[PDB]
């Protein structure tokens with residue numbers, strides 16, 4: 001009936017219509033001719049002003065002051081600023097609203113039930129790489145909270161016309177070195193080979209373990225990046241063991257507590273924050289399935305299966321599935337034992353369904369990327385697999401941005 | 406222009422140029438992507454152009470484009486449309502057309518097999534009774550005592566102002582779902598509706614979990630008729646587990662033959678509303694979806710208790726553990742019964758080979774990532790890490806409304 005995408009849950013037989021996609025002001029990669037939804041990364045003051053105006057409208061709606069005198073005055077205040085400087089500045093509460101709305105809008109994030117609970121650290125006064133490092137250490141401290149993890153984001157100064165960007169070169173604040181061997185293989189995390197070599201080129205003395213924490217490469221405006229080593233006591237790690245397989249602890253596997261993405265661009269009202277690292281807590285499949293079992297990551301599936309004495313010579317023994325389960329179980333068990341926040345893929349997806357229901361009421365829809373929301377093991381066992389989803393770009397947003405080298 | 410398609414495990418890139426051959430709109434727009442939706446929301450020159458396009462594909466396939474036979478065939482098609490408003494395929498064209506439809510099906514992981522398809526021409530069928538005979542031969546052929554062979558039977562095409570030939574069942578072999586008035590469903594909940602239609606059309610129902618349904622067959626503008634399949638035709642596989650002795654006690658079983666019977670086959674503008682086709686099962690279809698889905702047989706918790714797992718909490722991964730053992734039970738049992746089946750790792754490996762073949766042959770391959778990636782152990786298979794482009798090519802299989 002209604003002129004909006006009809007969305008169905010196939011488990012429950014229930015129907016909704018997404019009206020929120022009508023608010024999208026940016027085109028994704030799909031056309032009537034072909035869907036490109038499985039692609040990870042598919043390909044003027046007038047423009048700023050319209051984006052700025054739209055954000056200010058969003059802000060004044062969220063506080064129920066739409067059409068008010070303060071709303072119209074903030075609009076004139078922004079247009080004047082842009083008219084005289086070519087850019088504008090956010091009030092602090094606007095920044096807080098904006099950062100939360102960007103998380104809420106992130107189609108690939110399954111943890112958005114938590115979106116209203118986000119600690120926003122304003123670091124827009126930062127003026128050096130040393131200072132960026134201080135803000136980052138404080139972020140890690142506050143966010144780690146000795147294992148009782150707390151979502152947080154730290155926002156550094158915005159892109160300025162006629163000035164270089166603040167950038168954190170690492171993709172996360174905590175990552176394991178990846179050392180290329182003279183036989184062609186990689187010791188450590190192959191995902192991090194490039195950044196490891198950049199750190200070395202920049203004066204880092206490399207280790208040679210499988211789990212060496214990388215230093216941070218931090219770039220203040222118009223300067224070369226400076227290298228900073230995180231004090232080990234700030235980086236909480238969890239040694240992995242299995243509740244019944246005693247040999248598993250002997251594998252010497254471990255992972256860090258805090259997933260702190262640091263290379264994404266935060267866009268609010270046309271303003272761009274090139275350095276705004278944020279962190280939450282892990283879903284167990286991120287560590288146990290992707291980081292440890294991806295063939296192009298640590299790739300330990302065959303090793304674990306041999307320890308479990310599975311028939312690894314034939315696909316039909318399901319050895320890969322059996323090993324993957326035990327690895328995921330080890331991750332969950334070890335984090336719980338160490339008292340570090342973690343969420344399994346069942347609890348996470350069930351909570352995401354609650355979030356879809358909340359947002360249907362609050363906003364008439366919720367942009368979601370099915371391929372990213374459905375977990376990488378046990379897909380159809382979770383309720384999100386059976387939920388149709390509409391994907392679209394809303395602003396404020398987190399966006400990929402090219403690497404600074 | 407042309408999508409750059411990347412495999413994130415191997416670092417390799419291809420470009421899909423085949424998508425430019427699409428003449429039919431999917432549901433996505435630049436404003437929003439609707440790729441995760443299961444079903445679509447909703448003269449003579451049009452038919453003639455689809456017909457010319459198809460005839461051109463056919464003569465190109467036999468390396469005979471431009472030949473006189475090619476030219477004469479286009480004229481035949483034109484003369485027949487101009488006079489009658491439609492036309493008819495030759496058997497060879499029909500065979501080529503059915504294989505291309507399978508090749509083009511973006512949701513099918515089994516397409517490495519596409520060139521090997523037995524095509525039964527049933528277009529000389531005039532009654533429900535004759536459809537039933539054709540269907541029985543199809544099932545006999547395809548089952549082949551456990552050595553399954555892909556096949557399609559094609560019933561007469563749709564015609565203007567005349568009702569369609571339709572098979573009301575969604576598959577030739579389905580288990581009944583009985584709605585006990587105490588809320589629950591006995592049997593397969595996906596089939597409550599069809600089970601009830603069968604009863605009211607005079608079927609004597611059973612009361613089991615795996616009662617094979619009768620076929621409701623409909624010839625144009627007639628009430629459908631009920632036919633019971635001779636039980637010796639329907640190969641079934643009892644499920645047992647290689648190491649869990651109690652598993653067999655559950656009395657679980659599934660049929661050998663996945664034979665979809667409610668999809669429309671479109672070739673060169675002609676539509677075939679009854680054209681059931683069958684291949685062989687991938688184990689996750691049975692183990693994961695049919696048995697473990699919450700709105701199907703839903704056996705997870707039962708199995709998990711038999712394995713003495715902690716059902717209290719999600720974090721013990723009881724569901725993942727029980728699902729793996731069910732999938733193993735299916736593979737084991739089919740292998741023991743000498744009935745063809747393929748596991749999701751073998752299937753997806755072969756699909757990657759298919760993408761490579763098709764990249765060289767046609768410059769691309771339409772693929773629905775959400776359907777190709779298996780429902781358990783997704784990222785443990787190579788397709789997970791493969792970007793894919795989805796689009797509609799003709800000939801094609803399509804969904805169509807239920808005939809009731």
Ligand code: HEM
Nearest residue numbers: 103106108109110111114151152278279280281282283398
């Ligand atoms: C609080 C607990 C959280 C959980 C359990 C969670 C979970 C996840 C997961 C599993 C993914 C997929 C990541 C991958 O496969 O690599 C993801 C993506 C994402 N998350 Fe969340 N998240 C949480 C907090 C946050 C926070 C605090 C933010 C931002 C303030 C956030 C923003 C994002 C964004 C932008 C993506 C997409 C990243 C990309 O496209 O590469 N998440 N999240």
Ligand code: HEM
Nearest residue numbers: 507510512513514515518555556682683684685686687802
């Ligand atoms: C030979 C072995 C085959 C295997 C292993 C196989 C595998 C599969 C699987 C796993 C699916 C997903 C089904 C679901 O989740 O419900 C599928 C879908 C599909 N298959 Fe294949 N298939 C085979 C043969 C065939 C044949 C012979 C045809 C047609 C001639 C075909 C056409 C299709 C179509 C049109 C779909 C999409 C169905 C839909 O949208 O509901 N397949 N296949």
Ligand SMILES: NCc1cccc(OCc2ccc3ccc(N)nc3c2)c1
Nearest residue numbers: 111171172259261279280281282283286
């Ligand atoms: N796939 C590329 C790549 C490289 C490095 C990090 C990364 O992380 C994505 C991401 C972003 C935010 C997250 C928030 C919480 C969480 N548990 N995982 C999260 C994962 C993605």
Ligand SMILES: NCc1cccc(OCc2ccc3ccc(N)nc3c2)c1
Nearest residue numbers: 515575576663665683684685686687690
């Ligand atoms: N998803 C709705 C629905 C209802 C009934 C049957 C069905 O089957 C889809 C389908 C189609 C073709 C197949 C070919 C081979 C196979 N193993 N499964 C196949 C499964 C799908």
Ligand SMILES: C[C@H](O)[C@H](O)[C@H]1CNc2nc(N)[nH]c(=O)c2N1
Nearest residue numbers: 038039040371372789790791792
């Ligand atoms: C090709 C495909 O899009 C790619 O492998 C995606 C699939 N789904 C994903 N889902 C999540 N959560 N994270 C990922 O990195 C990916 N990778």
Ligand SMILES: C[C@H](O)[C@H](O)[C@H]1CNc2nc(N)[nH]c(=O)c2N1
Nearest residue numbers: 385386387388441442443775776
């Ligand atoms: C909503 C979602 O698109 C739907 O559950 C899809 C997901 N992927 C699938 N994949 C296959 N092979 N079969 C299916 O029925 C589905 N269902």
Ligand SMILES: [Zn+2]
Nearest residue numbers: 030035433438
């Ligand atoms: Zn799309």
